[PDB]
């Protein structure tokens, strides 16, 4: 019913993830959960029909190079929203135990006035991000619909190019095929933007939380100062039992972000490597502003979308961990008591190595990750320029 | 009238600022704003009008590949004082923000003599820098007036390939035009370099603060040296307290400095990139020391120099920042006193982490960037080669 | 007869390198070595034999552009087991140093119930490595007798080919040559992954040695906090110097296990960058799902397999040792004694550079190598696909 | 007369470049430079003559492609001995000042008896590495005048090939010219390989007196040990202002040596890097085991050994000044003394952020720069081996 926790503060993006059908079953009344569970298994008996009937578009049309590639990307591009779809109950315990970190947060009494200024804080962008990140799903969802509907080639018209076993260029009733496509592309397109902001959203509460971390430390600096009471170093040892556990339990939640959907993040990367060194074939063939300009554009503005994403808040991760340090900095340490004095030494050395999102401990998801990606398309691409 | 700090230290390069057409209203008397900001709005028209009829040479002359990639050029050239005279204005607050982050600086009382040292030793080399980096610019103001009246082919003798509603190939009131282009050019190669030395002279005035911060460390650690009385434990904690709030205050400078020119120095670099991708292809076709090949090398080492010109005091920063470590070391700390030895341990652990100049961060701006760039040219150059 | 530590450790790792045939003479009875060392001579000389043999095949058929870079790969597949062979022999007192460098321990007490408990940890997973690894070779000497008995083009049917002074094709009597090749193919993908392992137990034993050094690190803390008796920091300071000469101690074996094999690991990772340069143009002519497809993606997953047997336990090594800085975090140290909280501040000083396995000095072996690696194919491929 | 310091080390390396013809005019006596001076004005004149006739050679054969390159080669491989030539006497008041910066070391009375075990042991390796390194450009001055005898083409029998004003291939006193190119190639490969030894043993000093200075860390620390009189106390101290005032002097020794060579470390490097960009287009003409391809590789083994003479004792400064923090560790510093433990803390500080030496803050030289130059040669040929 209610929710402990940082279940409770990502309960917009809970609800989509499990309307939309991820096999999320834990997060609600058990008296639901049977007409749900069905629910999730229909979908991606729909996603895997569909999908499926690609590969009989791809293989069939397998003669043109061209068509190999267009198809290969369609179907690379949808093939994030399976893995991401099967990545969840697969890897499913760690989910429920990243969620219930932190039913047990750390708590000091007269100085939680900067808690709740910084939990509150957290939820509303935990929610403006799903507000902004979903939302521009539904208008890509359009930006693929209105696209459809301004070309013709005979092709049947059709959102996504693949074959039935009964007609569309012919059949008149083909509306339904495009109801269905139209209905599995809204649901392809958020199944994977659900997770991902999932992802995205836990790093964010860190980093709200990371950033509560830093503004007790001016505050907590000034309990130390001044030839001290004993309740003063009974009081500021703890102040810093309640700064060292909230930030070994950041550390923990990080830590097992990066274990939870470490190796998600990984196959998400790879295939967009796989994508963009396709998306860079189609972008020499562009001449001029066509409808299929923007198919090219359409999906590298996207499929770049989805690594900028991660990318940012992956970043934004480093450069609050490191920040720690610099604030850590801008409190009177100088006047500080001896015990305080040994704890900013220790708390510089370990804001010093920054907490990063290993991604299956390959790469860390950095911005200059999205500057190395976007930098191998462009040398990928007028390589490839100047050979054709 | 006067001025309450760093403003008062780059009144040359505001001035020029100021002169050239930046948008920048706050630095002199009201009873002067209004014609000035009247001859602010028609600059930036006789800007946008001369690179406005650079397109209409570009889009016409669109069918030779090799005048393509030409007037490609010259308008990605021009492409930078026309976003760094909208960046200004755009994001205008912080700029000054941190023109004024200066105007109450921290000051000790007996221990100022290096100080003013090192301040006024800024003062030179701020305007130093103005007299070689502007001065450089009328140089190349000049040394592209004189290569365009030793060449010609029938086209019109212009100083920029434009066209005109009127007639200059056979029109001999052209000279309007030229002394229209060659204001054009002087404000352009100005208004750029003008805004880049702002950026590039409050890194210099950092690292001439770091360098000033360096020399305090000997004289400081003489103080808590010997058993010592309160008077001294009083003033070594005042020589502390001058001593890292003066650090703090310049990296809350440089935090500044990166996030005023932060994003405007993406933009300049990512604009260089896409011309160094041009001007290898330019460089394939120099068949001999021409008057082409003075065109080639006359962007080349001017854009790249654009580059070399941030990589310099962007390196300087992080060479002098990590240096303070190395100076906090080089003092006397062995017979300090314990509250002087807890502090070296301390500052020894953030000046390791150095502070580096973030281009919107995607990159720091270091000489290794500049190498980076460099070598990414020659790759591709010698790659061009051999695919030609 | 018994053996004074580590060497007890890498039992089965020992006896199989001994039984395969490394020259390795000192872990038995003295009243074996003699009809033991006529055995690894015996075997090098049947090594050398036939991977003598395959360069006449090689030299005789070098007019084919194809079959020299087939079997120019299979002679360099075959390059490592000789190396390894001739490298153990040659550098071998730093191996008996390395296996020697454990006889004396260091041991505390009362705490040492989490000595043992990491103690046989390690000899499981490091019998449990050695019966992965050399239990797939095994799969894949069957993985390469499988496929040669699926296909025909005339040739001899051979394991590899080679060129006989007696004939395989016309005389029946070559099941003498299958045997000696299956002996040969057998021994050579076991005498090259014995002593990889060897490698990678250490690597292996030193991390579950650093896992073990976590653990202290919270019952440690706890001793020394509350007014502290003599007989509690006589206690504390010998938990410290249990610690610390056991974290110097196993900084010993990790200089030496990078000092004994890491000349050798430079050797392998420059031939299968000669290898996987080769593999590439191989990879090219792949037409479509074959014989030669499992013979091209048969090297190419085992020769990565090679590089990444080395670079996940080379990562993990590196991934716990900068994890002891985060682990000695995690303990109580903000209510320890001083003399505690000094020590975390040095132990986070140099848990901070993590213990790396330099490769001979250039690289050192991180998964981000094996990163650097396989994308280092595929940009030399799909530069290779476009330029064919 | 004697020598107050390094130059009396440097004893073997300062004859010789003197002796070669570097305008070093400071370490004998005043009634022996004048006869000297001329020596060294006309060697350089003698240099300068016939690379100046290699341009005549260069110039007139450019019609050939091919023999562009060749000479092309040869003439910036003997660019470097010009440049270093003329580097000795334009940047010279730094290198004196180098030599002259350890004639006044620090000491310290009992416990230099560590001084003189690495004072002496530098002395040898110092004199070792001449041994080896001059000693094998007088092998690549054999390796040179062999490889001429064995070939001819019809071309004049030339050490070097150039233009002459009196005739080589038909004038039988070419003998004159042979001796005189000789003597050319052999004071060309050494006066180079001269001054790169001087900066090649200063980082070998530097590296031994670093290994001096790991040796005395445990010593030191059993003096803080136990509780202890101020005539403890008093010698700690002044064993610490021993250990730092050392290490702030080999910082000052080795950020001098950076400052001393850095700039023609860079003009060296980038001299290399034109030159391997054309070895590489060599290196695809190599048909079979020619004359031609021992000067391919004549060369590359060569070049590529310039480059790796720096980058191991660079490697080797780093691989020592990182040390440092572990062998600091491996003192028993926990039993020391509390301003003994704080020593430790500061140390680790900075021997963390290890000396390199900036290639004129380029690059700096490490192994693995050496790792990148080599790397970029093989990715450079095997891209232009497949466009060929």
């Given at each position: 019913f209610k929710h402990q926790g940082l279940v409770a503060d990502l309960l917009p993006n809970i609800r989509v993830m499990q309307?939309?059908?991820?096999?999320?079953?834990?997060?609600?009344?058990?008296?639901?959960?049977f007409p749900h569970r069905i629910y999730c298994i229909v979908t991606l008996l729909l996603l895997l029909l569909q999908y499926g009937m690609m590969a009989v578009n791809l293989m069939m049309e397998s003669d043109d190079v061209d068509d190999l590639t267009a198809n290969t990307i369609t179907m690379l591009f949808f093939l994030h929203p399976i893995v991401k779809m099967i990545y969840f109950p697969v890897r499913s315990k760690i989910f429920y135990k990243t969620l219930a970190?932190?039913?047990?947060?750390?708590?000091?009494?007269?100085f939680a006035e900067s808690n709740a200024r910084?939990?509150?804080?957290?939820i509303t962008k935990?929610?403006?991000?799903?507000?902004?990140?979903?939302?521009?799903?539904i208008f890509s969802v359009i930006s693929w619909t209105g696209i459809t509907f301004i070309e013709d080639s005979?092709?049947?018209?059709?959102?996504i190019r693949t074959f039935y076993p009964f007609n569309a260029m012919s059949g008149a009733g083909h509306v339904f095929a495009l109801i269905y496509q139209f209905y599995y592309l809204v649901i392809s397109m958020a199944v994977s933007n659900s997770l991902d902001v999932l992802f995205?959203?836990?790093?964010?509460?860190?980093?709200?939380?990371?950033?509560?971390?830093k503004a007790i430390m001016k505050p907590l600096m000034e309990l130390s100062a001044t030839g001290l009471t004993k309740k003063q170093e009974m009081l500021v040892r703890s102040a810093i039992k309640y700064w060292v556990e909230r930030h070994k339990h950041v550390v923990r939640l990080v830590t097992a972000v990066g274990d939870a959907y470490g190796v998600a993040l990984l196959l998400h990367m790879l295939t967009t490597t796989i994508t963009l060194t396709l998306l860079a074939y189609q972008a020499t063939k562009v001449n001029g502003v066509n409808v299929y300009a923007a198919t090219v554009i359409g999906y590298l503005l996207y499929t770049l979308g989805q690594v900028f994403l991660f990318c940012i808040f992956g970043?934004?991760?480093?450069?609050?961990?490191?920040?720690?340090?610099?604030?850590?900095?801008?409190?009177?340490?100088?006047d500080g008591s001896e015990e305080a004095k040994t704890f900013v030494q220790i708390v510089c050395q370990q804001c010093q190595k920054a907490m990063s999102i290993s991604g299956a401990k390959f790469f860390t998801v950095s911005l200059d990750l999205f500057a190395s990606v976007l930098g191998a398309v462009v040398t990928y691409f007028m390589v490839l320029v100047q050979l054709k």
């Open positions: 309307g939309v059908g991820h096999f999320m079953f834990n997060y609600y009344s058990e008296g639901k959960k970190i932190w039913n047990n947060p750390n708590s000091h009494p007269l910084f939990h509150a804080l957290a935990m929610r403006r991000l799903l507000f902004c990140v979903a939302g521009a799903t005979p092709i049947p018209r059709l959102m995205c959203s836990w790093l964010l509460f860190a980093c709200e939380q990371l950033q509560h971390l970043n934004r991760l480093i450069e609050e961990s490191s920040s720690v340090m610099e604030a850590a900095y801008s409190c009177h340490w100088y």
